[PDB]
Amino acid sequence: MPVDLTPYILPGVSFLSDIPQETLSEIRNQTIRGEAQIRLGELMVSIRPMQVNGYFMGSLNQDGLSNDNIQIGLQYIEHIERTLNHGSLTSREVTVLREI
Structure with a gap:
């Protein structure tokens, strides 16, 4: 099922107001x-x-x-990449494995 996550979305900024952590779970x-x-x-x-x-x-x-x-997507995506693994790694930290 496509679990929608838009309770506190500001469609235009990279950050989110505050996400329920139970959703990331x-x-x-x-x-x-x-x-x-x-x-x-x-x-x-x-x-x-x-x-x-x-x-x-x-x-x-x-x-x-x-x-x-695409734009509002990728700013919220770079947010989600850090939010899915709190303080673990960034987008490029994984991408360089493929890129090199």
């Missing part, structure tokens, strides 16, 4: 199913640990979206 459990779809309102996101190269964190589903949905 349920996200981490459904990613183990192999996919977890999060809807940031209209912004479609897909958190899942694709076991080839990459941990489970903010991945914006750009399919079918518009330019603004």
